[PDB]
Symmetry: D2
Subunit: 399 residues, 4 copies
């Protein structure tokens, strides 16, 4: 259903390394990470200046203490002009991909010719909340609310952590502790393999952290999590969400993480005016939702909807990015859609790379473009579930 | 601009009363206020069921402790289906209007036929933050950050409150304390006049609060009755001691509230034979230096008029959001818009400013002004911290 | 065995009004209340200058955010000389009486001739704690600890509120909810009758809160709250459904301070002071922590034996009412008839500023002795953790 | 003097290692440290059982979050009977010594024959405070108060940290940065020499910390090893930038630790045929202007000596607590006490200053100094914030 509308081209993309929780990038705020990703993306487009960017959509979930309009801070921090229109987007884990859809639509309705879209998250710098200080609590202990748990990882209706709802997925779709563990080992191995072959080198923009008080500078170059794989330890670890007989574990779940990613989108007209070389074309997209506790399999709706919107058959896709909120999320959506694992997350997924929730929808699209390049594919599809019951998906053609 | 693209119709709108800070609505969360507006807006459309809504865009600025995806909680709380696509939008004070823009665009690209959009804010329930508990602070007094100040009212680059940058507006454009106060008095008078004549009755959906106390219905905006002109002219300034021109009476307050609009495509309007209230003619976002956000509407409003193919003179009524009295004064001066065409039922200085909601709140009020004043063409413009503004042009049908 | 040691004389006493939680006195800090009672107590001794006070012992339980040495701030706030030796004492609810014992001992060992002792508590201004901020806590909800609950009202071992162990007392010694309610009503009425008769007027030093208009606080805030039928119908407070302990038949949370002025035999003679009373003896005792409620049944006999005074020769007792059941159980255990217990009401009706109550009941006891024309009094007060303190006095 | 009061004997003492701030003992609470010291001190008395202890006085300054009656928790944690009378004492840094004085007095008035006294502090586990949650604060950032700073280290009248009032001491009595620095190096050298010679082995009760982690034993004080004379003389001042003379290396640190003594009457000493370690000869408290607390020992020490019937020249060893290097220098100047008789095994600048315990810690160390150096008469003095000091004189038997 998109072919009757103006075309939207990706002319570049970039991402930070993904840092572990309280880890390599924990000194940087979410706008600093997003600015880094936006600046790096634009630096790759010869013939396009940062001052050409008219509008920004940037995902961010746990915005507490980030300050006014995280997307605007990202844009100005990146060196974009003060004239740039900036909107922050929250569709929990789908934020980064919905931001890109919104950027594409803004080109399609004629209101921009150059848009930067993506997402950022600093889970390390998510604060705690004191909820009752204005009116007071006269007597009794109080709770300091962990903002990650409250605004990122707990389903609002059932007050269940995403991890507990992944257990519901395992039960609904018949995936044992062992199948999830072997999936996680495989995705770590793919991430380590791509890392070692240099296959993330182009998409990653290393971060230089200036030393303080004479201390040496630090360059963060690679994702922090992939090296953590220890197969023997992973198979023996205790469950994370259901004691004893739980199947979901910290090793086979996505971690908490810091990172950002950005894509640069241009209209057909701007591509011709500036004689730009496009990397990919956006073919279509789809959002879908169902029962909140079944958010884990919402991609099974979004992906067919995105393929239909793009006019592409599922069998024509050369590579899928199915975001690994949990290992069981990938396994269940592959099962429901009949997609073989050999076509899914070819450079590993968020279980091994990390899951900065506001950035991951854009992070996986950046990685998808690198997969299509390295594996000489043409058609890709990215899908990512989000807490609350939804998912977003997008189809790209590598040019 | 927009005339080459599919039409988008507003088939209804609704808003909560605007409650004062820690006031009439402080017991309700932002999604409870949002659900209330959404539900009330859909109840007005004869022939459209809540299950027909496909997608929601809802503004919300200070989202700390609201929980996962405020917009999704608004939608589910309103009785929408679990299949509904929900996104929360933050463009600070322009959030509720940008949400409506994104909703219109989603109809225009063919991805939805029925969209609900608007915004909500519970400033009363914004928490305080403890920023460094994960890594620890070994020794020394720490600080608890007020979420309203940090994420709502402080410009990130300068670390200045909006009211301090409103003083910049008064100096840049030469508006005295007296000019700002008399503006504020006039907009309170217009709000009180509209209240007494029942002109907000249609747009407001009253809220029923279960009582240890009797049961309370909140039917009115809480702020308009506070006008005391003698006290207003005598009060000390709020942001610069001694020489300041900006005061709490001539500034917008902190407030709680939500507002929603229902958007449909041309095909859906015809399939269901729905009666549209208005048509969206065009919109425009603009931005400039962050500390000059006060006059970004002087950019966004011409841009939206150009997108709509409408001349500024053909507009029958404007809503220029009153972040501060000086904001309305400065944009009227720069654009050459007479005050006789501006905020005809009062603005946010008198009505309240729940920041994530106000962009949609002013559009709901504009539709009422157009009907009451027998206007056809309306334009709403709202500035936002960080240097931005958003504006929207509508035609009353 | 005090008859062979130096005699200790009470030449005066004074207390603040006792304010309700977050109530009449909640704008004052604990040292501000303490300073008020100290200065007022000294104002009644003609011929004793505040600069004559050599040493201070002052009780205080929830000292968090009060600042360095609450007792020293009380002394300096009251106008005492910077040469004054100042120690803060925490024996939970017994702090104000143990402080008086320690002051009397410092007279007896010859290290001072003029001592001020007593207690203060501002439960209103007790803070909340954030315990793991130094090392940090990486992921998960944390707790803000109510300092009243943590440092004042919870037994350290069993980790249970005092009210829950008051339920133990009701069970162990067999006192129904009805009996506890009937005792609460009797002590409220006595407090109201002493109040209406002006019998608290001399011991209370009214507090002036400057504004816009000034506010004078003259009376205890709690006694008036009595509502017999509402009291008899309220749900329990520590065990839902079957509980016998309620907020109306328990002590409240309160703010207040109290002070007494002690001198030696020699100083009394030197400046020709008129003593109000003489300390005859004291006793501290302790037993099982959850049984703290009947620890005064050990400390009251110990104090009487130390004073060389029989239990039946006592004209009035102050048995502190941590809960109504505490007074009933100690009356039952010691064979004390209620007719000579808390004749102007007790903490259930007057309030329980925990660091001050040990001195508050002694000041009230001295007033009961004058009004009822008695000579011998004994004050006993239990404290969380399992202990109790008691003191025997003779009205001169 | 105390010649007219009954005799009070010390039959044993013991202390924990002194751990650094957030250091080797940071996992232990104040009552766990106190109970450890009490239990070890009683273990040294052959013929006295723990069930024989009748009353405890225990110092503790920053008692926030420690729970009801820290002294009672120390006593029960040590295995004392539930019949033990327990009182917690706060005279700031003098707490541990005022506690011993009160325990002696309770023996002297006949109310006990066996008393345990001392003090404890876990500065590592002092919390932060939220001061106005009960009443609320409607709008604006709030402050968390560090309990160490508020309840341990700030003069209440002037709101000055102790280290700032230490500079006053340096200016009042004319001690330069260099003199304070050379003093600190000397006391670190003395602490290290005592350590290596095992002179602390008797007084210290090592602490066993369980780990599937391997178990760790803390046997030494953590601070003495930190001496770096080069860094010390070049470090920047800690309380007055630029011109200041007081530094972190020449000040006492923040620390954890506890210490205890066991006291008996003459009758109980005879009944049980106990060999006493020492006899308490006298004591004295004194106080002056709060900001001049650094020199309050110069009143308390002569007062204690007069109470004990001992001339100053008769004393074989003094413990003058090193709240700061300048504090020991000033008191040696005022009293004419040569340094050759002061803190012979080092002081709190090198050993640590767990403030609620230091008053008892220096008496434990003093008894070791008297034995090691063939002395008979010793005097400990310790100042406290607020203007006070406490001092006590003992005879080694
Ligand atoms: C909206 C959406 O997208 S839905 C999903 C959104 N995101 C989420 O829900 C986040 C899910 N993940 C989480 O909540 C957190 O990462 C948690 C709770 C699972 C982590 O729990 P933790 O116990 O703190 O994880 P942790 O990193 O400490 O690992 C625990 C153990 O597993 C070990 N381990 C971790 N990863 C591996 C690995 N690949 N291989 C072997 N061992 C591993 C660790 O070494 C550790 O062992 P140890 O502590 O005994 O030394
Ligand atoms: C301005 C602000 C700080 C209010 O501060 P405040 O001191 O708490 O304001 P108050 O409501 O207490 O009003 C103060 C006084 O003015 C009086 N007052 C308020 N409105 C009045 C009116 N219309 N007429 C006469 N008097 C009025 C009040 O009665 C009060 O009197 P008092 O001192 O005797 O109590 C706060 O509302 C604010 O920050 N507004 C800006 C919000 C914002 O920036 N939004 C984003 C914009 S881009
Ligand atoms: C027991 C305790 C938790 C009370 O909690 P609380 O319910 O908040 O106390 P309140 O004053 O609010 O009482 C609540 C109700 O009781 C009523 N009430 C209280 N005292 C009353 C009285 N004398 N007569 C009639 N009604 C009374 C109140 O009117 C109120 O009614 P409401 O439900 O309409 O509000 C608290 O006061 C406490 O812990 N006291 C013990 C203190 C202590 O342990 N000290 C140390 C002992 S060792
Ligand atoms: C003085 C005080 C503020 C310490 O400040 P601090 O800077 O946080 O402590 P530090 O350990 O970091 O010391 C600062 C520097 O001096 C170094 N240092 C400490 N002891 C040293 C020593 N003996 N030799 C050489 N260097 C030393 C430290 O290694 C550190 O060096 P760095 O800058 O390279 O890290 C704190 O300990 C204090 O307030 N003490 C007074 C306690 C008190 O008042 N008690 C009551 C008295 S009445
Ligand atoms: Cl959703
Ligand atoms: Cl902006
Ligand atoms: Cl006890
Ligand atoms: Cl003092
Ligand atoms: K470029
Ligand atoms: K690169
Ligand atoms: K993992
Ligand atoms: K309807
Ligand atoms: K209506
Ligand atoms: K106003
Ligand atoms: K007098
Ligand atoms: K009086
Ligand atoms: K009561
Ligand atoms: K023994
Ligand atoms: K030893
Ligand atoms: K030091």
């Amino acid at each position: 259903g998109m072919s009757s509308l103006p075309a939207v081209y990706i002319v570049s993309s970039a991402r930070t390394p993904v840092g572990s929780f309280l880890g390599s990038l924990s000194s940087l705020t979410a706008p600093q990470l997003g600015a880094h990703a936006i600046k790096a993306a634009l630096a790759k487009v010869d013939g396009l200046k940062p001052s050409d960017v008219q509008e920004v959509f940037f995902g961010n979930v746990i915005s507490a203490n980030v300050g006014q309009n995280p997307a605007r801070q990202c844009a100005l921090g990146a060196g974009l002009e003060e004239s740039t229109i900036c909107t922050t987007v929250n569709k929990v884990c789908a934020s980064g991909l919905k931001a890109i859809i919104l950027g594409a639509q803004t080109i399609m309705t004629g209101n921009a010719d150059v848009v930067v879209a993506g997402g950022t998250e600093s889970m390390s710098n998510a604060p705690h909340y004191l909820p009752n200080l204005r009116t007071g609590a006269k007597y009794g202990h109080q709770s300091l609310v962990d903002g990650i748990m409250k605004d990122g990882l707990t389903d609002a209706g059932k007050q269940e952590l995403m991890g507990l709802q992944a257990e519901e997925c395992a039960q609904d779709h018949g995936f044992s502790r062992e199948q999830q563990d072997e999936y996680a080992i495989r995705t770590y191995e793919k991430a380590q393999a791509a890392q070692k072959a240099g296959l993330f080198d182009e998409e990653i923009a290393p971060i230089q952290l200036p030393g303080f008080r004479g201390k040496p500078d630090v360059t963060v170059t690679q994702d922090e999590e992939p090296k953590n794989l220890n197969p023997e330890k992973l198979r023996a670890i205790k469950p994370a969400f259901i004691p004893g007989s739980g199947t979901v574990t910290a090793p086979n779940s996505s971690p908490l993480n810091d990172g950002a990613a950005a894509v640069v989108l241009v209209s057909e007209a701007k591509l011709k005016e500036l004689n730009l070389k496009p990397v990919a074309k956006i073919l279509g997209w789809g959002d879908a939702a169902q029962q909140p506790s079944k958010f884990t399999t919402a991609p099974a709706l979004a992906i067919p909807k995105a393929l239909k919107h793009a006019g592409v058959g599922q069998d024509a896709i050369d590579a899928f990015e199915i975001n690994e909120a949990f290992s069981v999320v990938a396994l269940a959506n592959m099962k429901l859609l009949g997609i073989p694992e050999e076509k899914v997350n070819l450079h590993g997924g968020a279980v091994a790379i990390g899951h900065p929730i506001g950035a991951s929808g854009a992070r996986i699209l950046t990685t998808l473009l690198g997969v299509l390049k390295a594996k000489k594919g043409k058609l890709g599809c990215a899908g990512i579930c989000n807490g609350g019951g939804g998912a977003s998906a997008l189809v790209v053609e590598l040019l």
